[PDB]
């Protein structure tokens, strides 16, 4: 407004030549162009000096151009529906569509309750083949006695798992929390399974946009990770993918002290991801000490050599079996696709490229891995080449 005051006082309107008025109008137009907030170009446009200096159509063009520079739009988000009922079966179809569409657990409960109100039991869990629940939970869900409770558990967790898959973490939170509150009364097995799913979803939420800037986990989630790793419960069905996520979470958030020291050994003897993460944590933490790093370097080096060695005819990548390691090469690779920490990633890169070099390429920590390896002919170096190519691609996807 002070600039406009100086502008109005200095123009000498309707007495100055048309050249001065043209230059004046051009300056006002261009200072309007340079602005970002729209209220400022509006307040300049509302000025008497502006509306007098230029014509009507050009100022209208200017204001609409500035408005369309940063347009505001609104869009329909409610899914398309042409419903209105006609019959009982038509109502059944409409309710099935609404059950498919909905993601709010209260609406799921209402729809399922009314559907069972107007049907025998009809086992509505089957009303979408696109609801995949992992096979480890199929028996324990379909083992529920109550049909409405069984359908509620199945639908809630299937939709929660899908929402977790498609990165809709808030609705996944809602659905899994509702399923947890449902099963707390019926069984403790389903309660523990749903708590594990809650933990996995929480890991995913933090690894999503909530993290991704170095902000630490809440440290109750870290205790939850420790608890699931050290729960030791055989009767509860489990997915090893959750153990993978837990180990990757520990490595990513630099919980090397827990993996190196506070881990229990029965977990090592059972879970390969846990012992591999322990070698990774020990190797990265011991790097300044040459003799100290050397032992863990040979241990991790040897276990990966076994992983990338075929049993002495069909190749490792062709077979996916006949590998003498603690797990498949594919499983190892999929595990280290979950690692984002640059130090761990460059350690595995150094190990995989030393394997490439022996049977050149230089990495940051090539020195710590021995060149002489037993079982020379068992190593499927074509698989090692494929692994190192995919691994370096992944690391560059992490940090170009």
């Amino acid at each position: 407004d002070f600039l406009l005051e100086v502008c109005s006082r200095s123009v000498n309107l309707e007495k100055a030549s048309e050249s001065l008025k043209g230059n004046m109008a051009a300056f006002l137009k261009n200072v309007c162009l340079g602005l970002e907030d729209l209220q400022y170009v509006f307040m300049i446009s509302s000025h008497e000096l502006f509306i007098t200096l230029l014509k009507d159509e050009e100022r209208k063009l200017l204001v609409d151009q500035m408005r369309k520079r940063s347009p505001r739009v609104n869009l329909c988000i409610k899914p398309v529906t042409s419903f209105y009922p006609a019959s009982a079966s038509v109502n059944i179809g409409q309710l099935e569509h609404q059950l498919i569409l909905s993601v709010d657990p209260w609406r799921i409960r209402q729809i399922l309750i009314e559907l069972h109100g107007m049907t025998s039991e009809r086992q509505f869990w089957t009303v979408s083949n696109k609801w995949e629940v992992p096979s480890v939970y199929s028996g324990v869900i379909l083992g529920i006695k109550d049909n409405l409770t069984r359908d509620l558990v199945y639908i809630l967790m299937a939709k929660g798992l899908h929402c977790s898959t498609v990165k809709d973490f808030s609705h996944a939170k809602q659905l899994f929390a509702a399923c947890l509150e449902l099963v707390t009364e019926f069984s403790p097995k389903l309660r523990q399974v749903m708590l594990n799913e809650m933990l996995l979803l929480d890991i995913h939420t933090h690894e999503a946009g909530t993290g991704q800037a170095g902000e630490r986990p809440p440290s109750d989630l870290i205790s939850r990770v420790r608890g699931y790793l050290e729960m030791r419960l055989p009767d509860i069905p489990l997915r090893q993918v959750i153990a993978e996520e837990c180990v990757a979470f520990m490595l990513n958030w630099r919980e090397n002290e827990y993996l190196t020291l506070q881990v229990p050994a029965f977990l090592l003897q059972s879970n390969p991801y846990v012992k591999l993460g322990q070698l990774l944590a020990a190797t990265c933490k011991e790097l300044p000490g040459p003799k100290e790093s050397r032992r863990t370097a040979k241990d991790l080096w040897e276990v990966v050599v076994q992983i990338c060695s075929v049993s002495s005819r069909v190749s490792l990548i062709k077979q996916r079996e006949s590998t003498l390691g603690i797990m498949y090469r594919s499983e190892l690779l999929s595990f280290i696709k979950k690692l984002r920490e640059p130090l761990v990633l460059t350690i595995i890169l150094s190990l995989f490229v030393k394997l490439h070099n022996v049977r050149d390429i230089t990495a940051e920590h090539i020195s710590i891995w021995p060149s002489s390896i037993p079982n020379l002919q068992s190593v499927d170096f074509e698989a090692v080449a494929i692994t190192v190519k995919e691994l370096v691609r992944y690391t560059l996807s992490i940090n170009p």
Binding site: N30, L33, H162
Partner: protein, 291 residues
């Protein structure tokens, strides 16, 4: 409904078109639109069920060839014919094991004019995201591949980029809508930045402006930009800046300016590249008449 669904394995798009045309005599039309509604419910029952061998719907298998015309008839925006064709498109996209949904989404984005037609595109995505995954990366990839081929003629290309910019800006325009949808338009379009920079140098002016505006608002990838990716974006951005300054003067410059400013804020390397290329193109034998 059992006959038209379970057995129509021929040019039944003509059958569907005639049926919908009847819904556009009087009791015949009422019965036919009712029949259409029951047919949609029956097809939904056929597709989403039993859960594992699959079923087989010859009627839907007929329509998957005419998915483009099916999208085109939807954009006509009738009273409720577009609703029937929209629901049919959703069931079709779910039914196809190779997931024909991304093709439908690419068609909707590359043909829409009004923001209400974008609301149809978002409604399809909202209806489809409950069952399928990765639709937006696949749709963007297919649509950009078609742009980079001779297919998808430049008016449709400019429309696609305009609608994509509207979606990305609408997502940035945070509210209940983007929160509920969870489409992640920005996180998906960020993957294809390298495919969007060449379109910013397109000979067609509308395509160049549309790409410039989209890249002006589109977020950069989650971690950072690759040096080749960053340098390509900066070179394209400065070329677009000077070309648009030559063409439309200072009014037609803001999108390229915003893109270059964001690319400078990325890193000191990006900042130095932007400043160096900007002033070097300013002092070139070309573009010096502008100054």
């Amino acid at each position: 409904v059992h006959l038209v669904s379970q057995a129509s394995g021929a040019g039944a798009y003509r059958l569907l078109q005639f049926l919908v045309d009847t819904a556009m005599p009087d009791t015949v039309r009422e019965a036919c639109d009712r029949l259409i509604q029951l047919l949609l419910l029956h097809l939904q029952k056929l597709v989403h069920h039993r859960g594992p061998p699959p079923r087989l719907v010859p009627f839907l298998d007929a329509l998957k060839n005419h998915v483009g015309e099916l999208c085109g008839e939807t954009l006509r925006l009738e009273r409720k014919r577009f609703l029937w064709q929209h629901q049919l498109l959703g069931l079709l996209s779910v039914y196809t094991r190779p997931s024909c949904g991304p093709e439908a989404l690419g068609h909707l984005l590359s043909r829409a004019r009004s923001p209400e037609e974008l609301s149809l595109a978002t409604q399809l995505y909202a209806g489809l995201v409950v069952s399928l995954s990765g639709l937006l990366p696949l749709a963007f990839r297919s649509c950009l591949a078609r742009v980079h081929a001779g297919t998808l003629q430049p008016p449709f290309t400019a429309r696609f980029l305009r609608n994509l910019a509207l979606l990305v800006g609408w997502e940035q325009q945070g509210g209940e809508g983007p929160a509920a949808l969870g489409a992640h338009f920005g996180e998906s379009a960020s993957a294809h930045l390298s495919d969007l920079a060449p379109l910013l140098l397109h000979p067609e002016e509308e395509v160049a402006e549309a790409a410039a505006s989209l890249l002006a608002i589109c977020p950069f990838p989650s971690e950072a930009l690759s040096p080749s990716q960053l340098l390509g974006l900066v070179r394209a951005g400065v070329h677009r800046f000077f070309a648009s300054l030559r063409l439309h003067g200072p009014p037609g410059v803001a999108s390229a300016c915003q893109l270059l400013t964001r690319l400078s804020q990325t890193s000191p390397a990006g900042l130095k590249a932007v400043l160096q290329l900007l002033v070097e193109g300013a002092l070139h034998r070309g573009n010096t008449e502008l100054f």
